[PDB]
Amino acid sequence: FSNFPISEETIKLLKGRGVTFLFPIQAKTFHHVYSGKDLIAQARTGTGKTFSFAIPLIEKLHGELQDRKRGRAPQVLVLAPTRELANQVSKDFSDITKKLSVACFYGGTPYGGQFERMRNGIDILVGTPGRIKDHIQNGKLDLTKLKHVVLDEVDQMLDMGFADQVEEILSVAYKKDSEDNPQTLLFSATCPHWVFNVAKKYMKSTYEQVDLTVEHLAIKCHWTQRAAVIGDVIRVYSGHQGRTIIFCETKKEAQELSQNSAIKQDAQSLHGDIPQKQREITLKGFRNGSFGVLVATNVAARGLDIPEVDLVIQSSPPKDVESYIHRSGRTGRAGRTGVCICFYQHKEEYQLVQVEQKAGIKFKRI
Ligand SMILES: Nc1ncnc2c1ncn2[C@@H]1O[C@H](COP(=O)(O)O)[C@@H](O)[C@H]1O
Secondary structure, three states, X not given: OOOOOOOHHHHHHHHHOOXXXXXXXXXXXXXXXXXXOOEEEEOOOOOOOOHHHHHHHHHHHHXXXXXXXXXXXXXXXXXXXXXXXXXXXXXXXXXXXXXXXXXXXXXXXXXXXXHHHHHHOOOEEEEOHHHHHHHHHXXXXXXXXXXXXXXOOHHHHXXXXXXXXXXXXXXXXXXXXXXXXXXXXXXXXXXXXHHHHHHHHOOOOOOEEEEOOEEEEEEEOOOOOHHHHHHHHHHHHOOOOOXXXXXXXXXXHHHHHHOOOOOHHHEEEEOOOOOHHHHHHHHHHHHHOOOOEEEEEOOOOOOOOOOOEOEEEEOOOOOOHHHHHHHHOOEOOOOOOEEEEEEEOHHHHHHHHHHHHHHOOOOEEO
């Protein structure tokens, strides 16, 4: 915890909860929270949202700790949508502070126990909007002495219809336009319109906000039409004076394809079953413009000097992903965007996702 001003006492209590270092949401918000800045945080479940406000709030409060006076008003108000979530936030506070009085006020429980806690004095108050609004009406609860307000799981509170109850509580604790109002920490995962209306009505003018080359095409094609569609994509992306390299896994398929009526007239084959003398000649032919289509096998190309192309075609999702990405970087001539086409069948659909994941690319599925 070296980067942060967390006391040795708090560090020891934190190790009991299995906290030895801060999660990203915590490290990013700590100083905004500690320094008293207003904040809107967007974070998913399990990211450690509770400690991102609890740890810096407890540290700030511990540093300004004035004698525990009976009947004291809360300094912190945490609004939570449910009893279950309010009890977890309370426990999280209680487990890392042995100096501050932590109260949990939810509805559908006797008022007596809560009135007693209010008389003894509260430092940190966690509660559901209903019960907090009740004790405001009673007069018994004083929320005009607040330094900090946390609106936890805002989305859930809105989905449950607590918008108007929260706005009522906010109207008591906040003065419209005051730069002296409590510090507001808003926790909304999706940030609906209500969040930005609350921010411009109750929050400070300035607030922090924290969140948490080649075209690759994939064509679904039945093997019986592949050669016809190959002729069509060449016509479109390569055309006249163009260069296309087709990659076929088997030496048979590559030979069969270079001889297919759709491309045969402008194509030449290249594989392991062709002499080194024929290979250097076909490479010269491709490089000088004797033919525009070079049909090859993924392995029989590995160390070969292939010129810049306009279009790369894989007959099926490649096994050899590094050969695919290397050849992809040599596509696109005269400032035109390079095009890599990948043909696939329904059985090869997850294979496409594997290529996407290994290569760090996303295919346009057509
Ligand atoms: N820095 C941390 N190290 C270890 N566990 C943590 C840390 N921050 C939060 N947690 C735990 O992660 C879980 C999810 O946190 P939360 O989303 O706040 O409920 C809880 O069980 C926390 O106790």
